[PDB]
Amino acid sequence: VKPNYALKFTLAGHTKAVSSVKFSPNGEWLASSSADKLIKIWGAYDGKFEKTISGHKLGISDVAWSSDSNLLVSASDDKTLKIWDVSSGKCLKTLKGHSNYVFCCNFNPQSNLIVSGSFDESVRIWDVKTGKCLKTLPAHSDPVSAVHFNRDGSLIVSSSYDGLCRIWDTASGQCLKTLIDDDNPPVSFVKFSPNGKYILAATLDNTLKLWDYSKGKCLKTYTGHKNEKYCIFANFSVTGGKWIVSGSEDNLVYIWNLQTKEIVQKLQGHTDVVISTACHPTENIIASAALENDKTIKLWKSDC
């Protein structure tokens, strides 16, 4: 009925606002990125700092894991992405081609492609093996806030400040669907649901919306949190109860019942905007991260 997430750890070390946290697919690690130009790796279960990965020339807005938990990709204001070997900490490839800040990134499930979005208003698809850009998509008319592959990597969803969410065919780079809203608020985040049938989109009017993109039908809206300014991550929690999880500009983590849309828990502890949250792949664990008055990551655990 309701989860009971409780604070287990506070992870300090970043020296500027944290931007993104992601659990490894194997559940062992959390990676974080920051405006401080660093990636840090932490133990998912004991919160123990593992290592710092450095090399970007400017701040990092996003980080993502490969399926074998062996590679990370990061998206930086330095206009590049970097692919890293997590075990050695070494930069394997630098992905060059965007003409402005790279804001978001993700591997496909196969882990042979990376998708990125940029302030340059494009979405790029990259070959992991060669580090070469395969496709540049003239995707949006304003900064691209999020990019995400579906369950089998055949589709990409992108969101933008231009007010659109778009679905793309990975192989051809073609736009298959545009989702619109008459009042046209900036879209600050999007991702596919775990089954790939829906997308969850955040807009800067304090609203999260679950869409059946095929039908162009909005099925659920989640409200009551604060999101008017930042590109805050949201998540489907599937390990126990079925929840939607998001950060908020009132310094809380919000958790909603997926079906009823009721807020079922608010997690208190951060002292600045909660810009990023992540849900552990097998356990009822949430990671949350906050902006520069706080600069910490918190790990929370629930029984359901």
Partner: peptide, 8 residues
């Protein structure tokens, strides 16, 4: 970029 306000 993400940690700063950049949207309309």
């Amino acid at each position: 970029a993400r940690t700063k306000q950049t949207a309309r």
